[PDB]
Design a protein around this ligand. Structure first.
Ligand SMILES: [Zn+2]
Ligand SMILES: [Zn+2]
Lengths: 365, 365
């Protein structure tokens, strides 16, 4: 396999389906990436993550650079070996979590200090972890933002995008074996989104993320911004919507040209008792499930739905049992993978628009 | 398969090895039963429990009769179906936990009331769960106890043993498909242990537990009581030491004629960071493991030791990650199953005494 090759096999409107080939494996697009926080997809063995159909996972960097530490993981052979996932890993840059989880932060043009993460140090950390897809280090503008502050943040992010590009390219093994994605910023403003896309395309990246749209915008607003923002990006490279989302967010984003997704909702809300079904989410703790012998979802192909009832998982979650977290999480990630497969197949068959409408009518009934 | 058939294939001193055939499967003896609390072996799928080599699990009754409730589990098809374990289940009687975890208990000759569990109700609950091995409901004398109080409690337990026997036999489906074990009491007193054995043998049971020896006695004292107590029991039936124990407790108990064991140590202390190894237990949270790439145990055949390092599991446990609990637990139950297999094979080969000595010298080095 090549270091990086994105191929589009079929299209329908703005939607695409295809593949990203990388040294550690092939990624089917549109793709959902389960999130690995602290070198684990919570409550799942990596073999279970793969069994659900995931081709790639996201590793948060922030926690890892704090524990066990990046240099430590490098000494131990890298994140793939450490956690036992041998397929591609996309690593976030650490910037968002450094802002939201850290103390006494101090921002500057050089980077952020917290209780010094700069673009160079972020790219270095991603290297030490052995990331396959490295994200440029940026500033994730809050929502709402005034146009002046949005512009300022976006401009800084574009300077840091060039810094990230140069840092990555100056490390031979990283440039030869990994890929680098740039992140579009600009809040909800079309002119800033365009400036950002133009800056990123002049630098050149292997893929383009749409940053800053999962920090409080409602779906209508997010979709409106995607309508004008995704077409600004190079057509022939993957389009990654960071931090999105609910099943219906994903369908609509693919309708608007997105190829890749990550979010904590299937894992986090699985542990809290929310199960995704084709008829919408259910909260398994509700008393109406205490004697329900049906599987979480009536059509789901996952191992959990093959073997255990709603009633049993209801009991586990109410009891605080680890196995409850395990089963809810497996099911929910499997549901997300089955959604992505249905999306891929319907685009390939020229019937995605009909799928999206059918999906919506039943998911919201 | 028969409802119940215990066959002894080989002997060495007081040690035996053989099989218990039951309708839902064969149990290799000496046997270790992982403990299922609230219809789950904590942090493990039942297929994982079986993969480690377990032939039978213990289900605590106390929690289950409280949630989800026994009648509820019966309506849902029974505990095997509910939790997805299709092999034998031994259920405790609920009596111990009713005393240690309940509030305002009120004991009487009829049974115990708490915030009415009687022998009849206990046997009924075990039926509703669909237990394969039902335990007689008894009183688990505290340690220490004066001889007068030990005698009183043992005498009550023997009356309740007869009540349990009659309750079990009066339910055709239970008498035809399950087995019933009686529990020897008497604290640490030889004359009471003898009286108890005699009472139980006159009633007649399918197997005989040694009760009341895991409630604060040290190993030397426990072994001393086993020395005289196990020979009092019928030779041709299984001997079950309740609530024991550490690897070395198990080896010595088998040397004294015990066939079956349960305890929470591998599951509970796995979640707390203790891993069993042939060189003794280790506490994986210790800093000395932070960069140790070896498996938990150098010879262990388990999936965890095949794939993950000490360093990774160290990280998981310190981070509070569910996967840490999962891997520690799988390993520890696998270690216990491998110990039982080594014990079975060495008795069968006439070299168990040598195994026990070799085990001790290395486990305690
Ligand atoms: Zn499912
Ligand atoms: Zn192991």
């Amino acid at each position: 396999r090549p270091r990086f090759s994105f191929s589009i096999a079929a299209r329908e409107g703005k939607a695409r389906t295809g593949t990203i080939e990388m040294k550690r494996g092939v990624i089917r697009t549109p793709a959902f990436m389960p999130v690995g926080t602290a070198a684990t997809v919570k409550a799942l063995k990596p073999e279970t993550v793969r069994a659900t159909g995931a081709d790639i996972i996201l590793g948060n960097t922030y926690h890892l650079m704090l524990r066990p530490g990046a240099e430590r993981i490098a000494k131990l052979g890298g994140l793939h070996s450490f956690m036992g996932w041998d397929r591609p890993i996309l690593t976030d840059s650490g910037g968002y979590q450094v802002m939201s989880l850290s103390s006494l932060t101090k921002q500057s043009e050089e980077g952020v200090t917290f209780k010094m993460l700069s673009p160079e140090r972020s790219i270095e950390i991603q290297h030490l972890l052995g990331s396959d897809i490295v994200m440029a280090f940026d500033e994730c503008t809050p929502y709402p933002a005034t146009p002046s502050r949005a512009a300022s943040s976006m401009e800084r992010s574009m300077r840091w995008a060039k810094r990230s590009r140069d840092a990555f390219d100056s490390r031979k093994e990283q440039a030869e074996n990994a890929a680098l994605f740039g992140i579009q910023q600009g809040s909800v403003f079309e002119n800033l989104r365009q400036q950002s896309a133009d800056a990123l395309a002049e630098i050149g990246f292997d893929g383009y993320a749409v940053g800053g749209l999962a920090v409080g915008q409602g779906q209508d607003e997010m979709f409106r911004v995607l309508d004008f923002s995704v077409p600004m990006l190079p057509d022939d490279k993957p389009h990654y919507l960071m931090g999105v989302g609910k099943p219906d967010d994903i369908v609509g984003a693919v309708e608007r040209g997105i190829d890749m997704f990550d979010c904590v909702l299937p894992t986090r809300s699985g542990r809290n008792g929310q199960a995704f079904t084709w008829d919408g989410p259910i909260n398994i703790r509700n008393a109406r499930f205490s004697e329900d012998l049906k599987p979480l979802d009536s059509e789901c192909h996952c191992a959990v739905c093959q073997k255990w009832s709603r009633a049993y998982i209801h009991h586990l979650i109410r009891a605080g049992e680890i196995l409850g977290a395990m089963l809810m999480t497996e099911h929910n990630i499997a549901f997300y993978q089955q959604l992505m497969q249905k999306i891929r197949d319907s685009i390939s068959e020229g019937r995605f628009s009909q799928f999206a409408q059918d999906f919506r009518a039943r998911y919201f009934a």
